[PDB]
Scaffold this active site. Structure first.
Site, PDB file in Angstrom:
ATOM      1  N   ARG A   1       0.844  -1.186   0.000  1.00  0.00           N
ATOM      2  CA  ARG A   1       0.000   0.000   0.000  1.00  0.00           C
ATOM      3  C   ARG A   1       0.878   1.235   0.000  1.00  0.00           C
ATOM      4  NH1 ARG A   1      -2.929   2.745   4.630  1.00  0.00           N
ATOM      5  NH2 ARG A   1      -4.648   3.926   3.670  1.00  0.00           N
TER       6      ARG A   1
ATOM      7  N   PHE B   1       1.895  10.830   1.093  1.00  0.00           N
ATOM      8  CA  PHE B   1       1.390  10.329   2.364  1.00  0.00           C
ATOM      9  C   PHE B   1       2.370   9.333   2.996  1.00  0.00           C
ATOM     10  CE2 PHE B   1      -2.278   7.841   4.562  1.00  0.00           C
ATOM     11  CZ  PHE B   1      -1.832   8.281   5.796  1.00  0.00           C
TER      12      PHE B   1
ATOM     13  N   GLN C   1       3.495   1.654   2.921  1.00  0.00           N
ATOM     14  CA  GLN C   1       3.179   0.650   3.930  1.00  0.00           C
ATOM     15  C   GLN C   1       3.578  -0.751   3.482  1.00  0.00           C
ATOM     16  OE1 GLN C   1      -0.827   0.820   5.364  1.00  0.00           O
ATOM     17  NE2 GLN C   1      -0.792  -1.257   6.216  1.00  0.00           N
TER      18      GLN C   1
ATOM     19  N   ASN D   1      -1.867  -0.329  11.950  1.00  0.00           N
ATOM     20  CA  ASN D   1      -2.714  -1.097  12.850  1.00  0.00           C
ATOM     21  C   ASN D   1      -4.154  -1.118  12.360  1.00  0.00           C
ATOM     22  OD1 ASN D   1      -4.138   1.235  14.003  1.00  0.00           O
ATOM     23  ND2 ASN D   1      -2.205   1.687  15.049  1.00  0.00           N
TER      24      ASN D   1
ATOM     25  N   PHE E   1       4.659   1.606   8.389  1.00  0.00           N
ATOM     26  CA  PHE E   1       4.693   2.541   7.285  1.00  0.00           C
ATOM     27  C   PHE E   1       5.777   3.568   7.486  1.00  0.00           C
ATOM     28  CE2 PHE E   1       1.633   4.138  10.307  1.00  0.00           C
ATOM     29  CZ  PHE E   1       1.792   5.508  10.333  1.00  0.00           C
TER      30      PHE E   1
ATOM     31  N   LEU F   1      -1.997  11.510  12.481  1.00  0.00           N
ATOM     32  CA  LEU F   1      -1.739  10.149  12.943  1.00  0.00           C
ATOM     33  C   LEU F   1      -1.204  10.091  14.374  1.00  0.00           C
ATOM     34  CD1 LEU F   1      -0.178   8.636   9.708  1.00  0.00           C
ATOM     35  CD2 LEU F   1      -2.557   8.598  10.472  1.00  0.00           C
TER      36      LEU F   1
ATOM     37  N   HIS G   1      -0.867   5.883  16.043  1.00  0.00           N
ATOM     38  CA  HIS G   1       0.134   4.932  15.574  1.00  0.00           C
ATOM     39  C   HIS G   1       1.404   5.143  16.367  1.00  0.00           C
ATOM     40  CE1 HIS G   1      -2.277   3.730  12.065  1.00  0.00           C
ATOM     41  NE2 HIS G   1      -2.736   4.966  12.152  1.00  0.00           N
TER      42      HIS G   1
END
Length: 170
Positions: free
Chosen positions: A61, A66, A69, A108, A119, A128, A132
């Site tokens: 991903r 951004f 991942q 998660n 990531f 975030l 995270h």
């Protein structure tokens, strides 16, 4: 010392360079020890039947502007992964924040569901923070991260396969 670990990356099968990460063992030792051990593969095979090892796994991903991942070495699609502690482990601390490109943080499925997925931020991601657990940072090879970012898309789907061809601890 804070451990340094590395990924030797391929994109479409071709070498893309090495990412070196410093892990914040000082601040979040349990989270760091999981990631470190998954880089070396030293624990052997998990309850899942797969090596507890990032080697050969993909970044499944990737979203430009951004993050990138990866870490799902059991299913390869975001539904899998295993930690050295068991299926999942608790959020250790939120002392570090997503302050800059290269921050390394745990993916998660909500609170206290850390496994092996992680990531790397390509931008500061303050939204975030507190959600995270940040446990390290890229110290070498942000060009490699940008290389990976460019085969991502808004949906996260990659246009070329991004593989951790080798990894380990320095």
């Amino acid at each position: 010392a804070n451990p340094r670990v590395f990924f030797d990356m391929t994109v479409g099968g071709a070498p893309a360079g090495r990412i070196v990460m410093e892990l914040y063992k000082d601040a979040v030792p349990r989270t760091v020890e999981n990631f470190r051990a998954l880089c070396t593969g030293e624990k052997g095979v998990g309850k899942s039947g797969k090596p507890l090892h990032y080697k050969g796994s993909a970044f499944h991903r990737v979203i430009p502007d951004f993050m990138c991942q990866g870490g799902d070495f059991t299913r390869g699609n975001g539904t899998g992964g295993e930690s050295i502690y068991g299926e999942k482990f608790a959020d250790e601390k939120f002392v570090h924040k997503h302050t800059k490109p290269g921050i390394l943080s745990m993916a998660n499925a909500g609170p206290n569901t850390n496994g092996s997925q992680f990531f790397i931020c390509t931008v500061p991601c303050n939204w975030l923070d507190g959600k995270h657990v940040v446990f390290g940072e890229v110290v070498e090879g942000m060009d490699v991260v940008k290389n990976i970012e460019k085969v991502g898309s808004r949906s996260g789907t990659c246009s070329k396969q991004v593989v951790i061809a080798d990894c380990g601890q320095l």
